[PDB]
Amino acid sequence: QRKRKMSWKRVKG
């Protein structure tokens, strides 16, 4: 058994 681990800017128009 294995646990498996795995915009940020906005322009103002």
Added chain:
Amino acid sequence: NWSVEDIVKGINSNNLESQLQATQAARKLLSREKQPPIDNIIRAGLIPKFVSFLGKTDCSPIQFESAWALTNIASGTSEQTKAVVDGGAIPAFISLLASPHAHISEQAVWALGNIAGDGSAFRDLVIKHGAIDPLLALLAVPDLSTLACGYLRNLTWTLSNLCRNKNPAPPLDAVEQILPTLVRLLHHNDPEVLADSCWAISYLTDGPNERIEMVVKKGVVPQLVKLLGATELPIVTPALRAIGNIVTGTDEQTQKVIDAGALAVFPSLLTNPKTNIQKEATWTMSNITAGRQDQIQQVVNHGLVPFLVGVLSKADFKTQKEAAWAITNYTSGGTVEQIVYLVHCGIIEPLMNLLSAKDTKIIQVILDAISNIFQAAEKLGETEKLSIMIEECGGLDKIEALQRHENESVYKASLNLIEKYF
């Protein structure tokens, strides 16, 4: 729109009103959709002038125009964001959070969200300049519903960027300071606030189990499960990511998700028309079946084994790969009775069909599962019945052919299976 040359002439004029008109002209230029001349504005040397204008308390219009211009420069590449930081903008924007003009405080919130969103270093530098206390002060009202929608959405998004990025994760004391406000936002009725709150929670649960524990202790799992069931895809997507992150943790953290009723949503999630939802729901299932036997039993009780058979039979290949992991985890930790049930639900044929996949990793996962199922058959004395099943559906052909396969683990486990059971 003005030319950059004329903007420069106006900003260099030492006439405050001429500077204001030129800064507004720069703002409008930087607000146009197709290729705003950010690099031209930077190369003209205008960022330090814009930053100085942020401090002109007697001229709030030029504070706003320069904040907007700088916001859109900082919305670009890392090098463009660095130009804004290098101009001294971070403490100037933090000072503007206290502006009596809501549209100016909001613009400073926005600009700081772009700076902090660039990466972990600028995120942590914004924190070091003391942004968190004044940001949280803007939300210190007894009912969030008294704040303007757009204002609250911008604050939520900027807080989410202070929670994002890794190597390193955000400072522990900063996360502790933000979390109570984040929990309020996660209960607020606006879809965009909910989406960005969920994203923030998804960032904070993406890491070591100590980070997951800080979030789970705030009691948010029931609200995440509620948002898991929302009709808005922009809410379900980060809610599912956060739930999926939480079940990568300890068995006890995983149990909070089960206790909150999350499994009842997965018939819909595992058949969702959005590929990424199916994929991340199957990933979440794979980490639940990596849990305790009583947690595997909850997967059984909720009727989710047929849904795992379904995604294994037909889905995007990346989803099928997660389903293979879910089966291997299930058969690794499950009781014999649970593994018998999995075979009764029809897992063998879709498992064998995926041995044709030109992907070494999924083959190793599947061969592992087959081995685990045979070990359950040995304790029942029914390995012959299982061998006939695998042959009848065409699985012996593909295992046999996998003996002549390149990868070492493949043909090793492949030959082992045939020697011992075929």
